[PDB]
């Protein structure tokens, strides 16, 4: 379902979906299991480029997020047109050895030709078996 995220830009993200999660309830990310995410956003600029930057922290300490394609133009039709809406779907592979934590912060930032396209912070994710 739709999950709650905090916008760190200008409300370009319209919706974030995660099958099996809802609103601001704890969203369990299961180790060794695929995790599906969908985002719908409005382009705030014409841009040839969309570069995705993921910062993640476990118990207030930054951790590397593996298996992320930085070129968001791989998952939608670039160049982006200002004011058009783009739907991006991605399945992330959760490592079987992922550190179990009840305090996970994920910040996803998409940078365009002229600065930020989109920014969201998700604080409800919990990594469990």
């Amino acid at each position, epitope marked *: 379902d739709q999950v709650d995220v905090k916008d760190c830009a200008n409300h370009e993200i319209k919706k974030v979906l995660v099958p099996g999660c809802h609103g601001s309830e704890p969203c369990i990310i299961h180790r060794g299991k695929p995790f599906q995410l969908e985002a719908l956003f409005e382009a705030n600029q014409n841009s040839k480029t969309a570069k995705i930057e993921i910062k993640a922290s476990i*118990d*207030g300490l*930054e951790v590397d997020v593996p298996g992320i394609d930085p070129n968001a133009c791989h998952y939608m039709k670039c160049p982006l047109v200002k004011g058009q809406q783009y739907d991006i779907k991605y399945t992330w592979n959760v490592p079987k050895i992922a*550190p179990k*934590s009840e*305090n996970v912060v994920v910040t996803v930032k998409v940078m365009g030709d002229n600065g930020v396209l989109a920014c969201a912070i998700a604080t409800h994710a*919990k990594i*469990r078996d």
Partner: antibody
Amino acid sequence: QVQLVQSGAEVKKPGSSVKVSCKASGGTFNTYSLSWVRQAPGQGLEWMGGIIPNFGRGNYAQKFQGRVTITADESSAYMELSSLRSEDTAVYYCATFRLTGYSGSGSYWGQGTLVTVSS
Amino acid sequence: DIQMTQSPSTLSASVGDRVTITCRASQNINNWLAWYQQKPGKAPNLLIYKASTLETGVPSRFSGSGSGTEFTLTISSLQPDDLATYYCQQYHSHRTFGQGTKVEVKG
């Protein structure tokens, strides 16, 4: 028993750099965060930085960013502090803490390393 | 940067008295607050984690509480063994220690 063994105390010249080691025995840093904390004589505890070994790079207090490097695998952690000045004289400790997805504190402290910055 | 304001810096009380130490966080740290005791000439030792969870072996006189940015450590009946410096530490974002409270046991 889980024991963290640190490098022995030493004298470092001003402007030199020091690399303190923290070796785990009787267990590993897996399931734990590792932090480096300094205490100057007569002063309070100061967090230099920390890391989740094998899952992330060093995280640093902005006062110490760029002068501190912390690196770590499941059995060894290191703190390197460069451009040493007299104010860096302190006992340096390594300390573990259980990740929040596991039970118990997992709190263990090294014996501490007295670094004296002096000519 | 999350700042921890700990009060008082120094507390003097008699054996059997109830002492309370306060720690305020500059922003929300949820329940991610720890309390350490440092006895003189010794390494710090954990007393409380997750705001109210007692470490194994810590005496029942020690208790922890909080309002999400406001946290308190209570010793229900101060003992001579409790002479020490007590430090709060947030572990929600990075880690920050309070300035510490030196507890003097009089009488």
